[PDB]
Design goal:
heterononamer; A alpha+beta (about 750); B mainly alpha (about 55); C mainly alpha (about 40); D mainly alpha (about 50); E mainly alpha (about 100); C: about 40 residues; mainly alpha; 1 helix; D: about 50 residues; elongated
């Protein structure tokens, strides 16, 4: 009745464990299954697709298929998973500078109405011990002694571990990362289980390693599927999520590379899926013989009929592709049932645009939704055999460059930049393994901006150095033509405007007397011979503009400044920056000291942020070569004049990307970031726009910060005047500096 | 001939099932086929009966 | 009141069950006797 | 004694309905009318024989 | 935009896809289901009832030729969304996350 | 006290007499029952 | 109606409630030991001793529920003084609390003993077994400070303390109930919950509540794992049960589990060997297993607020390696499973080792004292604490309870400010205060509180008096005479009136030969006569220099420890019965930290009395403390203006402001 | 739902309470015993009636 | 001892009052079935006359 019915309804349910085929981690990278089918998950940073010639994606598919066809055992399987998702993990940053706070509030205001979503690719290469279903029909019933169960155990683990090594070696340019157990707080947290749980739950719940089968406790969201429909509903604590599945069932006379790219640019957060149950050469040859027989039992079409299947069968025997059973189920996530249907219709239009006729899954919604979890063939709706080249053409592991929002060595990403593609890039200095000589290290964090100036180079570097204060980083800025003075003053640090005819202001007279300091001072006076507190602030600046014409003085000035900054780096977040680097660095003395102290500094959170106006002038010298090759995060800028030799030979930039750089406008703000192998023609932009607040389109303009950040000796020579009249504090004199700016802006 | 109710029930059930395809969304021959095949089979059965008499 | 009430109500329910079964058995035994002594002649 | 306010009740999915192509009903009815008159005449001969 | 497109160099895809193993043009598993059903009818009511084979067999051939894998979808639906008991109570078919296997 | 003692007295007297009459009437029912209902059988 | 789930029937002895199915029960009120005072070294020893005393009385009959109930305490009442200065102090100090937590934790352990002219002797055997179990548990919990809940007569209407906890479990609000002739199941519920038939949330008669089931098997990392919940912005009742299994039953369960794990298609040697280790760890490790379900029932006002509470709790427990599984249809069973002796309604219990039960509920709580119910009205004041829990300070901590208090710390470092604050806010009791002073510490404070502080004659005229002997402190001729005279005259006044002493420094009068014996005898006489000594000392080495001082220190109730970096190791360590870890915490405070470690009974916390903005506390401490220039200004004003307390205080404010400029 | 119990006799209240609990349990088990005894007697007369009814069915 | 984890768990999961209510209810149900069976037999006999 009204009391006991709770238990009566409780015990009469089918738990989600019946549908989730997982169990104990057996190896730190491999998950078991109740049917003993061990699998591993492969997080992939898909390589860029926009910046490549059309033939070169063909070449990528060729290499990828060539590596696959070596290891594609008849016992394999693949589940790609491109889980488009929106970024909830990007914390708002505290700040102290008023100018920085204003800049960041304006910038984050400029993102009202933008796709803030990041692609996340995956791959789970699975390994069934036995291929043929007929004998496995018996094998599901027999009893095996534990020792032979162990024998199957090591056989499968070794086989899958070889597969993992081969895939890792084959994804060198794809930035792949095998996911494996990581420990938090004296307990084991699984890295793959979080992904497969995201497949089940729709959220990212950190899954610990408890003392049960994972099938028992891996679902924390009660799903609900409609009786007659295509959409469902996940009843969770944080809120309902309605999902509407979809299905592909009609191919065409084509496997054009990356035809499913259009769903990368989506406005709807979804989860694509695939499957490639690799299939035996006799069975594949029989399927192709069946197609041949059916076709040849008809009128003699001239060419589609005969020679095509001639070459198809001849390749299949000659080992150039491996057929397999495949199924793709795009599932869109949404908040209301109308909206998920709207997204489903959009996805159907997108798929029809690339000639793969989709039909929404209606009767097998639940079967499809349980067909996403890897190691589930019994739940796939429509497995249809295809060529392997074709499967790798339904999942070339293309991806827009996005970067890593969190998890970085310093923390959150420094800035977020508009991309011409549309998908936002989460910029950050620390790239992944450029040097590629040793795994255990601190992530290389350099940066090299190159390109003819006035195209925003000073604007760009000021923008990064203005937004990077969420880290509280020390900065030492060697600039040129007084451009950075206004910014460095705005960031509340000492800026020394070195100039001829005025006393230098700093000298080594009061240096400490220790024997190492005596060594340095002896070295300096041996180098000079030729023919207040520095610990006060955080963001320093020094101007070396007049030293470009000085052969002798560059060595003493840079020697002293660099030595003083050397004592600074004791583990605190330190960010050297520069400008037109080679001439300050065009010194015979400290190239060796620079490389050695570079290797030293890189450990305790050191960064070099280089710059350049004429990259042709830099690559010539010896010193600039090691520094070009020692920068992870390139940032190229545009130039009306370009040369093939410098950009390709020196900067490891491909031919298509070089033509892309040449194609850039003269003064259009567009700079090609190149963190690692991945590329993306991003553009931070400071144009006019509208704000959605109180129903008011409050016109907001970044020029009030452009005339601050942008380099102008003229503006600086009146900024210096107004600071001389009132030099109280940058937080205080900023409004009146803007006032005098408004006073001259019409004279 | 009891085969007369027999053909009645079989042909009517077959017609109902075949027209259930339009709801089931497994047939893309809505107008031309559902008149043409139905009229062909109907004329065949009518000829069969008018011959049997 | 309370637990003692439950005890008292319980044994009186048992007592009236005893009265019911004794009445049914007495009537049904007298019925058996009467059908028998209806047969005997 | 009433459903508790602001909670997740039954699904909003039961509201779904299967749409009807707005020609199936009318022509299906007329088709059954004609097939039925044929079948009734047929059983008229069935009993008459 | 226009991500990589085709210029007739696309890798050939042959239409041996979902050309299921078929006898008379009908897959083995569903045709065996029909054989079992008609055999049941023949053994149950009357023996004249292997004439029930050709009608439904032809309708199954027409179903399979149009949409090659209807029967797999049918069986998946029947097994999962048709078995789930409490469809009415929840307003939708749902499976409890916590594993209540009737134990204590 | 008085009420509990009265309830216990009713317990003893009435319930014990109810089952005593149950036993005696059941035994008389059994005697007559066997007798007549075997008689006409 | 609702009694279909509540098993309670009536009492069998003063301290053992019965059950409908004859399952005798007992309730204990466990204060718990502080997990901040002692380092990580002693927590393991605590768990081990609890394991020892549990397996000592291990039997298949026993069981244990454990509840951590959090309250938004309202029973702490506002009090109105009869002086404007104290009212000002109270009003600003209370306004210093807008936005704080104001939540207390209570920990309850219940022991239920269900058996599995003979009948009467078996009734006696059952009750005797349970009382012996209670005696052993009480011997065990001496450090924790638990008290045995038992009946308490209130004016001819006998009541029953254990019913109150079992009421709060179901009613959700402390509704007192009398013991009466019904079975308590009929009327123990007053505000009956109304669970939504789908079971996501609930109701009460005001507060919506959703649940979480914390099903964990892995051995805990910390001896208290999910103690992050002890500090949170939501109320709950976290419940654990330990229905023991007889030793053969535990062996059989482990054997069946190992067999069913073996007979599978995948081999996991990280599990089978561990379980097989535990199976003969059970025999030799001597811990007895049992059933265990864990449920957290957060309360709220808005249903969305309850879901936000659940999400916060789920995150804050994933931070400690446990995964909460939300409850959707089992909520009715879960809630009716909270009542002790409701074995039937547990959702899905699974056997847990004894170490892991005592390590999931180890009886840790931040020390918080008694909000009310004290022998002297409510708690005097509500001190803050590190980690944000309100300590409800009071001098009466466990034949009236002992009240003597000592305040050891430097006079410059906030001793006098603290004493003035405590006396001013404890003026709500209207007790007589007989103040003694060193270096004119409390002259201004007393004169503000309407005393007749006599800087250096019957007590009926005023309530407060203060005698200053800082002039006559170190002059061995007649301290003993003057102290006998003051003590004798004050003692003559000691009858009926709620009474108090304050000694700023006592070790000089302590070395008196004649006076010390009189003090000890009068102490023995007064302990039942509402006597509250408030001792103090500038530095403990001054006190422990005298031997009799140790004897007087042994008879003290609450110790407050200011920040004294120059603290001798021996004094705090063995002289004052402090812990080594507490000695570390004393030194951890800076020179002028303004925090202090209050060892109250056998638990302690850092009562950080912070005078932040929101400041009027600056003005109050400016008038609270006493300096010779302050004293001379006060004396001049009092001489010229008159006697009344509040007439001169604005003039004093003006003159002191002029001095500060 | 009456007022509190008489506090003058704590011992008497729960003394009679334990007495009542034991007596209730004893009377309920005795009632179960008589229940199966009556079930057996009812079965015995039921089969006597059935046997004579069949044998007298000519 | 009991030596059965199922036995101990089900012992905890069981209450005396409900078990005995069910026991006496089943005993009375069986007694009623036997009584009705006896009435059926007597009806059969009284028919068996004629």
């Amino acid at each position: 009745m009204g009391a006991i019915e709770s238990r009566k309804l409780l015990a009469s349910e089918t738990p989600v464990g019946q549908f989730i085929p997982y169990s104990h981690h057996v190896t730190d990278t491999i998950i078991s299954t109740k049917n003993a089918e061990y699998l591993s998950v492969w997080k992939i940073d898909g390589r860029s697709h926009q910046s490549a010639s059309e033939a070169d994606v063909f070449q990528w598919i060729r290499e990828l298929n060539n590596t696959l066809r070596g290891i594609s055992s008849a016992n394999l399987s693949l589940w790609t998973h491109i889980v488009r998702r929106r970024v909830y993990e990007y914390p708002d940053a505290e700040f102290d500078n008023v100018f920085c706070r204003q800049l960041d509030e304006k910038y984050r205001e400029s993102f009202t109405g933008y796709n803030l979503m990041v692609n996340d690719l995956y791959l789970t290469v699975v390994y069934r011990p036995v291929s043929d279903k007929v004998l496995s029909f018996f094998a599901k019933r027999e009893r095996e002694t534990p020792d032979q169960k162990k024998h199957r155990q090591e056989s499968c683990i070794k086989a899958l571990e070889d597969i993992n090594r081969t895939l890792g070696q084959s994804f060198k340019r794809y930035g792949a990362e095998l996911l494996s157990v990581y420990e938090k707080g004296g307990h084991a947290f699984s890295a793959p289980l979080e992904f497969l749980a995201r497949l089940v739950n729709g959220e990212h719940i950190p899954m610990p390693i408890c003392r049960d089968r994972f099938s028992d406790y891996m679902a924390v969201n009660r799903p609900m599927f409609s009786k007659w429909g295509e959409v469902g509903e996940l009843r969770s604590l944080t809120g309902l999520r309605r999902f509407g599945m979809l299905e592909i069932r009609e191919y065409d006379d084509a496997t054009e590379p990356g035809q499913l790219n259009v769903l990368l640019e989506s406005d709807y957060e979804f989860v694509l899926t695939h499957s490639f149950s690799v299939l035996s050469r006799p069975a594949a040859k029989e399927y192709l013989q069946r197609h041949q027989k059916n076709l040849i039992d008809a009128r003699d079409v001239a060419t589609d009929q005969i020679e095509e299947i001639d070459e198809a069968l001849n390749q299949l025997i000659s080992g150039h592709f491996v057929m397999g059973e495949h199924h793709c189920t795009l599932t869109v996530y949404g908040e209301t049932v109308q909206q998920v249907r709207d997204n489903l219709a959009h996805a159907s239009a997108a798929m029809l645009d690339v000639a793969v006729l989709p039909k929404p899954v209606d009767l097998a919604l639940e079967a499809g939704y349980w067909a996403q979890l890897p190691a589930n063939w019994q739940w796939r709706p429509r497995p249809a055999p295809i060529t392997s080249l074709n499967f790798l053409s339904f999942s070339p592991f293309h991806n827009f460059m996005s970067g890593k929002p969190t998890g970085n060595p310093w923390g959150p990403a420094v800035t977020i930049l508009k991309t011409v593609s549309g998908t936002p890039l989460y910029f950050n200095f620390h790239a992944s393994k450029e040097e590629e000589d040793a795994t255990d290290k601190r992530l290389l964090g350099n940066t090299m901006l190159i390109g003819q100036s006035s195209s925003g180079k000073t604007v760009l570097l000021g923008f990064l150095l203005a937004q990077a204060q969420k880290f509280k980083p020390t900065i030492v800025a060697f600039d040129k033509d007084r451009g950075m003075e206004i910014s460095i003053r705005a960031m509340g640090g000492r800026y020394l405007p070195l100039k001829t005819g005025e006393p230098s202001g700093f000298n080594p007279f009061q240096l400490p007397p220790t024997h190492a300091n005596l060594i340095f001072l002896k070295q300096f006076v041996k180098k000079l011979a030729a023919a207040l507190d520095l610990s006060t602030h955080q963001i320093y600046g020094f101007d070396i503009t007049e030293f470009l014409d000085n052969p002798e003085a560059r060595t003493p000035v840079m020697m002293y400044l660099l030595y003083r900054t050397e004592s600074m780096i004791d583990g605190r977040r330190f960010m050297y920056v520069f400008d037109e680097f080679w001439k300050p660095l065009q010194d015979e003395y400290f190239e060796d000291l620079a490389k050695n102290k570079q290797k030293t500094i890189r450990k305790q959170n050191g960064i070099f942020v280089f710059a350049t106006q004429e990259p042709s002038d830099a690559l010539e010298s010896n010193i600039a070569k090691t520094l070009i090759q020692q920068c992870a995060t390139y940032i190229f800028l545009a130039n009306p004049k370009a040369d093939y030799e410098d950009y390709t030979q020196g900067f490891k930039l491909t031919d298509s990307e070089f033509e892309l750089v040449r194609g850039l406008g003269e003064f259009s703000r567009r700079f090609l970031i190149k963190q690692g192998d991945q590329s993306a023609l991003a553009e931070m932009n400071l144009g006019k726009f509208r704000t959605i607040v109180d129903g008011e389109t409050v016109e907001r303009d970044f020029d009030d910060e452009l005339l601050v950040l942008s380099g102008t000796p003229d503006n600086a020579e009146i900024a210096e005047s107004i600071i001389a009249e009132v030099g109280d504090d940058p937080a205080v004199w900023l409004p009146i500096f803007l006032d005098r700016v408004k006073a001259e802006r019409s004279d | 001939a009891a085969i007369t109710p027999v053909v009645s029930v079989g042909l009517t059930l077959g017609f109902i099932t075949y027209g259930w395809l339009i709801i089931r969304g497994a047939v893309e021959m809505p107008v031309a086929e559902f008149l043409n095949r139905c009229l062909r089979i109907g004329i065949i059965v009518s000829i069969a009966l008018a011959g049997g008499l | 009141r309370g637990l003692e009430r439950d005890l008292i109500g319980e044994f009186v329910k048992s007592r009236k069950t005893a009265w019911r079964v004794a009445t049914a058995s007495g009537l049904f035994g007298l019925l058996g006797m009467v059908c028998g002594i209806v047969g005997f002649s | 004694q009433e459903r508790i306010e602001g909670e997740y009740g039954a699904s909003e999915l039961a509201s779904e309905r299967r749409p009807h192509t707005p020609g199936a009903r009318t022509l299906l009815m007329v088709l059954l009318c004609v097939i039925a008159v044929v079948l009734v005449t047929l059983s008229y001969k069935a009993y008459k024989v | 935009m226009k991500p990589p497109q085709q210029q007739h160099e696309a890798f050939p895809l042959f239409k041996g896809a979902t050309r299921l193993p078929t006898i008379w043009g009908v897959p083995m598993i569903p045709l065996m289901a029909m054989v079992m059903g008609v055999a049941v009818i023949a053994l149950t009511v009357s023996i004249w009832w292997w004439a029930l084979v050709p009608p439904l067999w032809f309708i199954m051939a027409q179903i399979t030729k149009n949409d090659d894998k209807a029967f797999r979808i049918w069986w998946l639906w029947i097994d999962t969304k048709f078995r789930n008991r409490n469809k009415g109570f929840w307003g939708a078919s749902s499976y409890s996350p916590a594993n209540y296997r009737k134990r204590r």
